[PDB]
UniProtKB/Swiss-Prot annotation:
Cofactor: Fe cation; Ni(2+); Zn(2+)
Protein name per its UniProtKB record: Cysteine dioxygenase type 1
InterPro entries associated with the record: CDO_1, RmlC-like_jellyroll, RmlC_Cupin_sf
Organism lineage: Eukaryota, Metazoa, Chordata, Craniata, Vertebrata
Covalent link location (3'-(S-cysteinyl)-tyrosine (Cys-Tyr)): C89-Y153
Family the UniProt entry places it in: Belongs to the cysteine dioxygenase family.
Principal EC category: oxidoreductase
Length: 186
């Protein structure tokens, strides 16, 4: 019985219930993420920015079944074109806006990766991606407003691939946490 999360802590409790089993009801997870109304005071602890690139801040390690983290995007900060390592990936905006650009999986032939579409993800909206849908790039294109997003991945993963937009060639990247549970982890 999906109820509206009252707070971030409540959302986390609800997520532990939704991931109690072996499968994932994507539409339910997306719905409860969207229903949480971002309250900056509840997540300030995790919103640790870096001047030069976006940061990944672990919030909850789940139940063996999911990571939950907050990403902090300075003005002009963005990601590579990347995959999600056979995991579900939910992205909910907590503050600001992000541009999501979708790409198809490249062919073996070296070729420019042409965007398939783009959209603007706005505060409180929750997007979903997985490798069957495609690849994406996420960017804070704002010149004046930092963005903060809440990401849930299931199963957890700590590596993915970055794709060269000019060729489609991929390289494996290991993702690192800037902080965990509010503690900076250099
Ligand atoms: N998956 C990316 C962020 C955009 S979804 C990352 O984990 O760093
Ligand atoms: Fe992503």
């Amino acid at each position: 019985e999906l109820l509206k999360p009252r707070t971030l802590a409540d959302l986390i409790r609800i997520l532990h219930e939704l991931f109690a089993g072996d499968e994932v009801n994507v539409e339910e997870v997306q719905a409860v993420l969207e229903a949480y109304e971002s309250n900056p005071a509840e997540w300030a602890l995790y919103a640790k920015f870096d001047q030069y690139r976006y940061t990944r801040n672990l919030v909850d390690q789940g139940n063996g079944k999911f990571n939950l983290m907050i990403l902090c995007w300075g003005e002009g900060h963005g990601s590579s074109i990347h995959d999600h390592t056979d995991s579900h990936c939910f992205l909910k905006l907590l503050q600001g806006n992000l541009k999501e650009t979708l790409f198809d999986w490249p062919d073996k032939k070296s070729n420019e990766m042409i965007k398939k579409s783009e959209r603007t993800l706005r505060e409180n909206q929750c997007a979903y991606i997985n490798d069957s849908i495609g690849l994406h790039r996420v960017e804070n294109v704002s010149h004046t407003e930092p963005a903060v997003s809440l990401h849930l991945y299931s199963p957890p993963f700590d590596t993915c691939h970055a794709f060269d937009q000019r060729t489609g060639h991929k390289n494996k990247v290991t993702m690192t946490f800037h902080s965990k549970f509010g503690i900076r982890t250099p």
